[PDB]
Design a protein around this nucleic acid. Structure first.
Lengths: 675, 48, 70, 43, 91, 48, 102, 112, 49
RNA sequence: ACAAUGGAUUCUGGUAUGUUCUAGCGCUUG
């Protein structure tokens, strides 16, 4: 063996490392088995360094501690190999070991849904006829929704410009493109492959699915049609959210009003207690099974569309070189994938609720309820599940237990799961954002009741459909020991404290909702708002992404990107900024990085060279037009004792300074409040 | 003896190498069978 | 071409016959100069009543790609 | 790369080229009487 | 605007894949005047590929296809991997 | 003497120890005429 | 079957040249010391200049013969195969090398 | 001087060595096949093979590094399967019932 | 047939910019040599060495 | 009955890079 034969064998190594990155199995015919044993060994050596460096740098990026601009893109590319590789492993394990649902499970699941639709007397959605009265308007709504991307961006590639021309043809000849869409729903069952690209959000990496534009049009028409026909027929009940009737902060307001309005929720005269439950529904879209899914859709949709939908989920998935077929999981990137996800949500809702109580929540089919309304109080008093809603995969349940019912419920869990050491307080989780007095106290009676609540709910749903775990679960119990009912809505962290348990009544700043009973018109509870910690890190990730995308970008673009991100935070979070101290720190550190980006553009970071007149003057006078949020005295009060109780605002930390004093106004004044 | 390495990604000398040289065996288990039949049997029971 | 692997590494035989320079480096300054010597509401529901040598198949890797993707 | 940053720093130039500088080496431009505090090449 | 595949563009695409392999599609479509890299990749994986068999089904394959199509209704990309056929052939 | 031994005769070092080029410089001259921190720091001490 | 090892190939090349040396003596027969300088240490061997010539000529003849037997193999194998697509001679010699693998 | 040639045949790629006070030479092979040789003679008296892990590749069975402790009764080996294996010389073994491999030199191997 | 001839030309070209410039620079260097040798041969005919 | 005040600036930036630029005769033959 010479310098020639040693030169060719090092190719197989380079080729096989590409194959491992591609997740393509590397097999060379006629390769000697000792050498193939050697090469596979060093790849797995290199694989461990390739994977562990990818883990180690994600922990750096989430901390935010000095990651190079190239290293962010490299780590973005390393994860999306690993995520799709984990996806392709999971597809093969389902294929080898069969569907995760057992045939007894799927029979019961199907029987529940048939019983619900028959109880509602739901009539199935037909295929859209050739003469359809709303056919031109629904087609327009789909194309406008596809069009709304284009007005924003300037330059377009070939696939974008193809998608322009296809929509423009559909404007010109609506009747011609309707017949084409009606044809593809009938006949087409094999589709073009779909590209995954991943968005970097610095705390997670999120998938974005690109559908071929000719297929994208007929999906968008189908989506507009199915959502309209479902709402005409009132398919989805009131608990399924978002309503299309309310914004997510109004959703928090009605829900928090809805807890207060329900009778006797605050009374702890007897031993009765109130429980709110929060879980994610796990990988809900990921665990959908198509054979179950096609069988479920035939109840409600004409089978030609239901055959289209199931075939549309099964497509080839393409990364830069890797490719696999989605045998199992739901593609969320489809335009009609919202309709599957909420409908598969309805099946899970019936499993938790049961056939009887879901009728009470929805009301009768002729006169369905409001989102928090029952027909009579006696309907309300039965069956301890008081309020229910489901945002997407987040589940919110409100339980009211009598002392007898709570004791029965908690003993049988201790029967099934005992604790001699009484370590139920250890694995429990609650909000660490609130003070220690203010968060839920770990009284062993209430903690045992909270776990018994979750254990009842976890048993109702099979693990094959969704993964419901205690670690994702947030349960709060209201009792004589706990005057605080805690939950987390879309981005809000809410403390609901009733008026009589307040132990003194003080006026509050406007970060406090006053909850009104409907029949008294008297304010009988106070809802306390904070921005969730997850949303704070999410806003910090946006500021980083503005800075990281802008290499040598002009000053007015960076200022405009700051304004549109700052308004998006403040207009959505209007009433929960004021309580949250950590968000106010991120607003200061965020805004001064934008000002440093201008100060990096010029070669001086000096303070006196840049008076606040430079940044905050409007564009019509030549300034950047930056919108201010951090020229604010930030409340500082005694971090040793602020974890214990709510100290109140006793001292003010300075937010932003300059040599020359200017009292720059802040938008929170200029945005009228949610309540 | 070692085969020569023909790669799908790189071609440094730009060689024209035949299409077979550039570029499963199992069946489904009965879990997919018994799933589909139980869904049909639940369906026909629902129709009746 | 012009982008090659190595057939052999740069040997220290070549730099031994060179004449030295005696440039003064910052890390060759005197430091550590002394050596140390050793001496009834339930019934209405429908359903009523560890280490692998694989970094990609690991349990920490699955908990990684569930939280870091979302 | 095109830059309208130049018209921004020209517009704010009597504040950018202040004489209240903390540290800045005083140079004069070659043919004129403008004193530059430090180096701002865009100015 | 979407063009149709002539036999000239196919034989250029065969020689380019023979030159460049199957993972450099934008370099392949640079030889094809009027043809996207997404089109030429999809054209290879569905029609041109010599691994694909454009043969008639046997009597066993017809019954085995009808068996799969009740097992997985209707999941054609999954069936075509079981049948080892192209998917539009299976439909 | 150090400047002129390096051949950098187009850089004028005045009596107040400012270092200015006497002409517009080609890129090969700009690379050669880059003086390190140790040269300039020594010059700024003398200028002080 | 299989290949021949280098120690076996060296013997057969050894045996073949002895038969060339046998017939060279037979074709010749058909037509019709050691001094060690003590001061230098060197050893001198007196030998026939004809046999040194015949050694030098035969090695040049065997070198030219293998040079020509390979040159015709270059000209033949270039003009044998033209079915599979090629670009240059180095592509042709490589894809033929793929054929000997299988 | 060449003291001895050991009886290492068909072992392929020896990654590590370590010599005991008790004239036990350890030879770690890349094929896990770890062998113990009498030092003064060269007799392979034991030849073991390792178990990798619950799941790993077959190449992972390879000893990479080895040393004895100061007492010489323990053998710490590091292998490719991310593991550290400690090898104990078992007590209550005698020349009878544990002879090891038989001392059998041959002509055919030219080793001696 | 025009794009076929363009594709036929592109497939049969495997060198790159450094190689093609190097081929041209060697052809110039050989031609510069041959002219200088022929120039010396003519001056040798004229007796100037 | 509050006296609490961090910053600050230089260097690495599409014509690179490369070649040739013999005036001043080395003895004889050509």
């Amino acid at each position: 063996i010479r310098q020639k034969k040693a030169r060719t064998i090092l190719q197989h190594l380079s080729e096989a490392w590409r194959c491992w990155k591609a997740n393509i199995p590397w097999d060379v015919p006629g390769m000697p088995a000792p050498i193939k044993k050697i090469i596979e060994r060093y790849i797995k050596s290199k694989a461990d360094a390739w994977v562990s460096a990818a883990h180690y740098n994600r922990e750096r990026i989430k901390r935010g501690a000095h990651v190079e601009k190239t290293m962010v893109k490299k780590n973005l590319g390393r994860l999306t190999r690993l995520w799709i590789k984990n996806e392709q492993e999971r597809q093969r394990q389902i294929q080898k070991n069969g569907p995760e649902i057992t045939p007894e499970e799927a029979t019961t699941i199907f029987s529940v849904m048939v019983e619900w639709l028959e109880s509602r007397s739901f009539s199935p959605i037909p295929f859209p006829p050739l003469t359809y009265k709303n056919d031109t308007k629904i087609l327009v709504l789909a194309l406008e929704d596809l069009k709304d991307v284009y007005a924003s961006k300037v330059r377009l590639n070939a696939s974008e410009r193809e998608e322009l021309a296809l929509i423009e043809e559909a404007y010109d000849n609506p009747h011609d493109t309707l017949n084409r869409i009606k044809k593809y729903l009938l006949t087409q069952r094999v589709f073009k492959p779909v590209d995954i690209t991943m968005m970097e959000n610095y705390q997670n990496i999120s998938p974005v699915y690109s559908v071929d534009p000719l297929e994208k049009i007929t999906d968008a028409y189908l989506d507009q049609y199915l959502w309209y026909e479902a709402d005409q027929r009132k398919l989805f009940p009131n608990w399924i959210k978002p309503s299309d009737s309310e914004i997510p902060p109004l959703l928090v307001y009605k829900w928090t009003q809805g807890i207060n309005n329900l009778s006797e929720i605050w009374d702890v005269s007897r031993g009765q207690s109130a429980v709110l439950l929060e879980t994610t529904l796990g990988e809900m879209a990921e665990k959908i099974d198509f054979t179950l899914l096609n069988r479920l859709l035939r109840l409600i949709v004409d089978p030609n569309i239901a055959d289209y939908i199931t075939a549309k989920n099964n497509v080839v998935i393409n990364f830069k070189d890797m490719s696999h077929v989605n045998k199992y999981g739901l593609i969320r990137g489809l335009k009609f994938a919202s309709f599957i996800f909420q409908y598969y949500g309805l099946v899970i809702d019936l499993l938790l609720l049961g056939q009887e109580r879901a009728t009470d929540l929805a009301g009768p089919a002729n006169n369905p309820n409001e989102f928090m309304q029952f027909k009579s109080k006696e309907v309300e008093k039965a069956h301890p599940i008081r309020l229910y809603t489901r945002y997407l995969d987040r589940i919110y349940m409100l339980f009211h237990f009598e002392e007898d019912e709570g004791e029965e419920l908690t003993d049988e869990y201790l029967a099934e799961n005992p604790d001699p050491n009484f370590e139920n307080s250890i694995g429990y989780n609650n909000r660490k954002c609130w003070p220690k007095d203010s968060r839920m106290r770990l009284i062993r009676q209430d903690v045992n009741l909270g776990r018994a609540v979750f254990w009842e709910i976890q048993s109702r749903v099979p693990t094959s459909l969704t993964s419901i775990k205690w670690e994702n679960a947030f349960v709060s119990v209201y009792s004589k020991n706990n005057p605080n009912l805690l939950f987390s809505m879309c981005g809000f962290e809410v403390r609901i404290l009733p008026r009589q348990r307040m132990e003194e009544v003080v006026s509050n700043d406007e970060g406090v909702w006053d909850l009104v009973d409907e029949r008294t018109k008297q304010r009988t509870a106070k809802a306390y708002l904070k921005v969730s910690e997850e949303e704070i890190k999410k806003f910090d990730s946006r500021i980083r992404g503005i800075l990281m995308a802008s290499g040598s970008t002009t000053f007015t673009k960076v200022a405009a990107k700051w304004n549109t991100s700052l308004i998006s935070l403040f207009t959505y979070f209007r009433e929960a900024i004021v309580a949250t101290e950590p968000l106010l720190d991120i607003l200061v550190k965020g805004e001064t990085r934008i000002q440093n980006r201008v100060k990096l553009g010029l070669n001086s970071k000096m303070p006196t060279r840049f008076p606040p007149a430079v940044f905050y003057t409007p564009k019509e006078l030549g300034g950047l037009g930056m919108i201010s949020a951090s020229h604010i005295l930030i409340p500082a009060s005694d971090l040793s004792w602020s974890k214990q109780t709510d100290t109140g605002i006793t001292h003010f930390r300075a937010g932003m300074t300059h040599e020359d004093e200017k009292l720059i106004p802040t938008i929170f004044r200029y945005i009228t409040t949610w309540e | 003896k070692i085969p020569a390495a023909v790669s799908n990604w790189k071609n440094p000398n730009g060689y024209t190498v035949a299409l077979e040289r550039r570029v499963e065996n199992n069946t489904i288990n009965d879990g997919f069978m018994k799933l589909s039949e139980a869904l049909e049997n639940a369906d026909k029971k629902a129709r009746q | 071409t012009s982008h090659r692997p190595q057939l052999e590494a740069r040997s220290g035989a070549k730099a031994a016959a060179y004449t030295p320079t005696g440039i003064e480096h910052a890390r060759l300054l005197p430091g550590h100069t002394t050596l140390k010597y050793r001496k009834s509401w339930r019934k209405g529901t429908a359903f009523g009543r560890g280490y692998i040598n694989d970094m990609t198949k690991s349990e920490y890797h699955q908990e990684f790609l569930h939280k870091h993707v979302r | 790369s095109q830059i309208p940053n130049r018209r921004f720093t020209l517009w704010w130039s009597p504040t950018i080229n202040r004489a209240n500088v903390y540290v800045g080496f005083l140079v004069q431009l070659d043919l004129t009487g403008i004193f530059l505090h430090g180096k701002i090449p865009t100015l | 605007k979407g063009g149709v595949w002539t036999n000239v563009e196919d034989q250029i695409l065969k020689a380019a894949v023979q030159k460049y392999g199957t993972h450099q599609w934008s370099k392949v479509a640079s030889l094809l005047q009027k043809k996207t890299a997404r089109q030429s990749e999809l054209r290879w994986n569905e029609y041109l590929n010599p691994k694909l068999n454009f043969t008639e089904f046997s009597k066993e394959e017809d019954a085995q296809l009808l068996d799969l199509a009740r097992e997985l209704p209707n999941q054609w990309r999954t069936i075509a991997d079981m049948m080892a056929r192209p998917a539009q052939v299976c439909v | 003497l150090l400047i002129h031994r390096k051949g950098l005769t187009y850089l004028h070092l005045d009596y107040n120890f400012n270092l200015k080029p006497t002409k517009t410089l080609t890129t090969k001259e700009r690379k050669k005429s880059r003086l390190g921190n140790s040269f300039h720091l020594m010059r700024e001490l003398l200028k002080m | 079957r299989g290949g021949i090892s280098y120690d076996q190939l060296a013997k057969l090349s050894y045996e073949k040249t002895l038969r060339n040396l046998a017939t060279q003596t037979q074709n010749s027969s058909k037509q019709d010391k050691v001094q060690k300088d003590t001061k230098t240490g060197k050893i001198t061997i007196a030998d026939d200049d004809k046999l040194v010539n015949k050694l030098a000529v035969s090695l040049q003849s065997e070198s030219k013969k293998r040079y020509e037997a390979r040159k015709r193999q270059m000209q033949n194998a270039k003009t044998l195969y033209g079915v599979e697509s090629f670009i240059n001679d180095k592509n042709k010699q490589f894809n033929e090398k793929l054929s000997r693998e299988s | 001087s060449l003291l001895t040639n050991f009886e290492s045949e068909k072992t392929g790629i020896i990654n590590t060595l370590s010599i005991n006070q008790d004239d036990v030479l350890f030879a770690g092979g890349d094929n896990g096949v770890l062998s113990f040789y009498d030092y003064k003679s060269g007799h392979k008296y034991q030849s073991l093979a390792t178990r990798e892990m619950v799941g790993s590749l077959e190449g992972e069975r390879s000893v990479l590094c080895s040393t004895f402790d100061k007492t010489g009764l323990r053998l710490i080996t590091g292998e490719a399967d991310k593991s550290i294996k400690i090898w104990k010389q078992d007590e209550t073994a005698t020349k009878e019932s544990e002879p090891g491999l038989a001392w059998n030199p041959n002509l055919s191997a030219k080793r001696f | 047939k025009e794009m076929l001839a363009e594709a036929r030309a592109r497939l049969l070209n495997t060198q790159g910019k450094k190689a093609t410039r190097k081929i041209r620079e060697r052809m110039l260097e050989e031609s510069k040599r041959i002219a200088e040798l022929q120039k010396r041969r003519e001056l040798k005919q004229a007796g100037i060495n």
